[PDB]
UniProtKB/Swiss-Prot annotation, chain A:
Domain S4 RNA-binding: 108-174
One matching Pfam family: Ribosomal_S4
Species: Saccharomyces cerevisiae (strain ATCC 204508 / S288c)
Chain's role: Required for the early cleavages at sites A0, A1 and A2 during 18S ribosomal pre-RNA processing.
Cell location: Nucleus, Nucleolus
Protein name stated in the entry: U3 small nucleolar ribonucleoprotein protein IMP3
Record-level Gene Ontology MF annotations: RNA folding chaperone; rRNA binding; snoRNA binding
Quaternary organization: Component of a heterotrimeric complex containing IMP3, IMP4 and MPP10. Interacts with MPP10. Component of the ribosomal small subunit (SSU) processome composed of at least 40 protein subunits and snoRNA U3.
Keyword RNA-binding: yes
Recorded family membership: Belongs to the universal ribosomal protein uS4 family.
Keywords (A to Z) from UniProt: Nucleus, Ribonucleoprotein, Ribosome biogenesis, RNA-binding, rRNA processing, rRNA-binding
InterPro entries: Ribosomal_uS4, Ribosomal_uS4_N, S4_RNA-bd, S4_RNA-bd_sf
Gene3D superfamilies: RNA-binding S4 domain
Swiss-Prot record, chain C:
Compartments it resides in: Nucleus, Nucleolus
Residue span of region S-adenosyl-L-methionine binding: 95-96, 114-115, 139-140, 159-162
Cross-linked residues, Glycyl lysine isopeptide (Lys-Gly) (interchain with G-Cter in ubiquitin): K66
Signal sequence segment: none
Outcome, altering E24G: In nop1.3; thermosensitive allele showing a decrease in histone-glutamine N-methyltransferase activity upon shift to restrictive temperature
Root EC class: transferase
Spans through the membrane: none
Protein name (record): rRNA 2'-O-methyltransferase fibrillarin
Swiss-Prot record, chain E:
Basic residues: bias regions: 1-18
Annotated function: Primarily required at the G2/M phase. Essential for viability: involved in nucleolar processing of pre-18S ribosomal RNA as part of the ribosomal small subunit (SSU) processome.
Oligomer and partners: Interacts with snoRNA U3. Interacts with MPP10. Component of the ribosomal small subunit (SSU) processome composed of at least 40 protein subunits and snoRNA U3.
Upper classification of the organism: Eukaryota, Fungi, Dikarya, Ascomycota, Saccharomycotina
UniProt similarity note: Belongs to the SAS10 family.
Comment field (misc): When overexpressed, has a role in the structure of silenced chromatin. Overproduction causes derepression of gene expression at both HML and HMR, as well as at the rDNA locus and at telomeres.
Domain of life: Eukaryota
Species annotation: Saccharomyces cerevisiae (strain ATCC 204508 / S288c) (Baker's yeast)
Compartment annotation: Nucleus, Nucleolus
Part of the whole protein covered: 561 to 610 of 610
Protein name stated in the entry: Something about silencing protein 10
Swiss-Prot record, chain H:
Annotated family: Belongs to the FCF2 family.
Subcellular location(s) per record: Nucleus, Nucleolus
Region called Disordered, residue ranges: 68-91
Native species: Saccharomyces cerevisiae (strain ATCC 204508 / S288c) (Baker's yeast)
Biased composition (Basic residues): 75-91
Complex and partners: Interacts with FAF1.
Superkingdom, taxonomy of origin: Eukaryota
Designated name of the protein: rRNA-processing protein FCF2
Cysteine disulfide links: none
Entry function: Essential protein involved in pre-rRNA processing and 40S ribosomal subunit assembly. Required for the early cleavage steps of 35S rRNA at the A(0), A(1), and A(2) sites.
Location of this fragment in the whole protein: 110 to 216 of 217
Amino acid sequence: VRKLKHHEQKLLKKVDFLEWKQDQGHRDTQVMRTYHIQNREDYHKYNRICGDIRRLANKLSLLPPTDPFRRKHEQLLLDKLYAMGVLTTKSKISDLENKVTVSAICRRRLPVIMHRLKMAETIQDAVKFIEQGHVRVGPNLINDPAYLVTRNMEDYVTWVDNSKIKKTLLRYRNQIDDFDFS
Amino acid sequence: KLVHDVQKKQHRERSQLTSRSRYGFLEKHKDYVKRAQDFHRKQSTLKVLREKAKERNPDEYYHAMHSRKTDAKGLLISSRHGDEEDESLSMDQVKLLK
Amino acid sequence: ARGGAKVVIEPHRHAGVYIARGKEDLLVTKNMAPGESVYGEKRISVEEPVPPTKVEYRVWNPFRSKLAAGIMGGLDELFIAPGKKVLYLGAASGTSVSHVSDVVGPEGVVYAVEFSHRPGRELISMAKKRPNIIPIIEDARHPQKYRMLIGMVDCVFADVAQPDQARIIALNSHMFLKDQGGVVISIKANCIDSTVDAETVFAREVQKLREERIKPLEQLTLEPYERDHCIVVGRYMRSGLK
Amino acid sequence: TRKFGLVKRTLNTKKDQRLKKNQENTRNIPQVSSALFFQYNQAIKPPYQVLIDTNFINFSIQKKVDIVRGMMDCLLAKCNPLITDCVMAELEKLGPKYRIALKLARDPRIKRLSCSHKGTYADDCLVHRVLQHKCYIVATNDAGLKQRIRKIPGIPLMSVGGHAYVIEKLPDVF
Amino acid sequence: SRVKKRKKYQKAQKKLKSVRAVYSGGQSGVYEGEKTGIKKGLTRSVKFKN
Amino acid sequence: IKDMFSSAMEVARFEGAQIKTVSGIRGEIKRALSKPEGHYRAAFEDKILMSDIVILRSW
Amino acid sequence: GLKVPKAVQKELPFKSQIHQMKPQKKKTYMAKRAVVLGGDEKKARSFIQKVLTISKAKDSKRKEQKASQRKERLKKLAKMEEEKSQRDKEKKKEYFAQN
Amino acid sequence: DDNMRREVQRDLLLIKHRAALDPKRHYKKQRWEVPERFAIGTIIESTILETLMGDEASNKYFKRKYNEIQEKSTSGRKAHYKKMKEMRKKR
Ligand SMILES: [Zn+2]
């Protein structure tokens, strides 16, 4: 507000308009920038799931360790959370509470994957190509930027065929073929 | 420590057989170790460079694929003059430069 | 180091001071009154654009001036500046005070103070080509005598070799010196005390300055140029000396 | 003609200036003294000017020596011992069961010299009066202060042991 | 031994010109400034810490 | 490697021998080359030069 | 220098394609145009190329002189690190021999 | 300005590398980036590039000390490569 003086300071030791304990460090904004996600409520739509992983992790930690339910049941779950690809490794059972973060689930987003597979140059520019309609998964093109992509389905993202951005790529290698009308 | 000055004397190195002087300069050990380092300083930057050939991912699109062009053999060409401004003189510039 | 060679001038880290980066380097300040060197030092000329005007630069001999080595030994903050008033003490001639006039420029003034008449007579004749120098020929031990002539100076300079050097600055720092404006003492070890050592006088004259509410910032020794001196850049706190 | 990849404008934390934590956003090489030789310190000649700790006074009482008369036995020349203003502020702060040291500290042959500090802590008042001049001769018996001065070149440290005092870095012992 | 004392001190007086800038002579020549050069950013001055 | 062994039978008395060079690389001598009477193939650990002189230690 | 095979150089990703400028053969108009000041300027252009040769090599020998004495100093430095390593073990026996 | 550059550019390039001009001087170690504002001038009581090559003692020094580095930089490279391929081929 004012860079209040030293005697103003001690009466206002606690007031701050920009940063609140309720606001929690602005972690939600801070990862919305790093992954460039469109609408604001998208974070806490993941962070309700990413919290719900840990609540199932916790009560499955409260069962006794030599229980053939419990031993079966999180390894049943780490099969799925690795196939979807939110977590890097399948070995640790305590990745399921420690490595399950929103920024883990927010980088199996489609524009991050187009930046991981070096399709677009940056991560904003990949959102620019999805929204304009140049990218596709198998048959159908995808148009929501915020498409989660399975690690299995991560094989199949390509540029949409006959596009003006898959035509320019093939001109760089001097390998167009207009019988494909690339 | 406890060693004479004669025990640390010298051991000189001998030269090429003078009958075999055509194939000049016999290489000792310390002249081989300059040769096998900087072959392994070539493969280790070539096996890496061949490893990027296996993983090209041919859907990659960087936005500087308009200024670069490629020769018909397949490897790219870059201009001698380098700059964006030394391309080719216009007819009005030649009409002044002549 | 001849009259033929051409030298690059470059602004020093301190304002108003200029370095002459040649084959060897020189310390240089712009001559306010061109065409005349006041004690025969070799002066540099340039030209700046009407045909280009002549701007003459005068070399700043280290061995002549006790201030001069401290620049060339390296001081962090020299409180003399191209706009500020500056009080000078013990300017026998224009050996150094003509230099201090040129570095404060045509805006700020310099108050030359020295007691003796025959060096003071020379200080008059130089002061009528440099408008900044107004010379005062009263004794520096009695500042109430020239109280009418000087008002609110921004940094004093002390080149007195009298052994009561701390009291002769306190009576000039309390009554003339603008608060929070620095004090550049130049201590000579032989002229204060010849019995005790060179370094004791330096530890004695600093502690005498701290009694007079001058927190001294840094201390230089200027040894390769002059034997056994110090210049001690102070700051006149007067209020919050801690 | 609206732009692509639009996103709700929101508050940068790593970059904005209005935040408190983000509000924040010439070398110096001190010359080794013109007195000093490699370690010899060729300037110090008698009489000496010796700084004194709290601890040097306290062990002076237990070992039954005068300050001034007892220092001249160790030192063999004349000396002017001088307690700073920080050190006298410690001797008062030690309190009631050290008051016999506080009487012996204020003696008109024991000089006092002021300092310009914001503090009582004289263990670091003292080294700072030593680096900037190197004419003094520190009298301590603090363990950490000895290690703080034995790294400084050319400063005769002085401690009390057994009967009389001892000096360390004087080359002119006798 | 009186030579090795001489050739030590004469060797350990060259080092003294390299650690600090020791006084030498005066100025007997004509020239004013410095041969080795000026630096702007050195500030070889003991600053009085608080 | 030439002119170390005289006959192709002389090589066969010596195959499997840990040959070394001046440069310090090791190797073995493996088969007697036939069509000239003296020479033999030898596998070193790295590419021998032409300028290099193989020596087989013996007692 | 290393010479990459062209079959390796062809299928490289776009980030790392090595820029190898072909030599020019047909004489450019500019290289038939430009004037070279000869005579007195040649004596003052040979000389600058003769000074900058000296000051590059005087640097790269003295810069090599530091990393020769860097190698010697850290050998002397690690020897002082080893004595402060072993003797620090010996105190923590003679301390805990009391305890 | 960008006029009168050449007699200035040769001069400043002869000051950024002034350690090499005489093997007895050995200035302090500094970098001397070209400053933003400067004014080349002479000493009142022939630019330094023209001044220096008019000397004979320095000009005989650089011709020796340039051939003596270029006797070293040539030494391994390709004249030495062709001679070793020459003696194998010649006999
Ligand atoms: Zn204090």
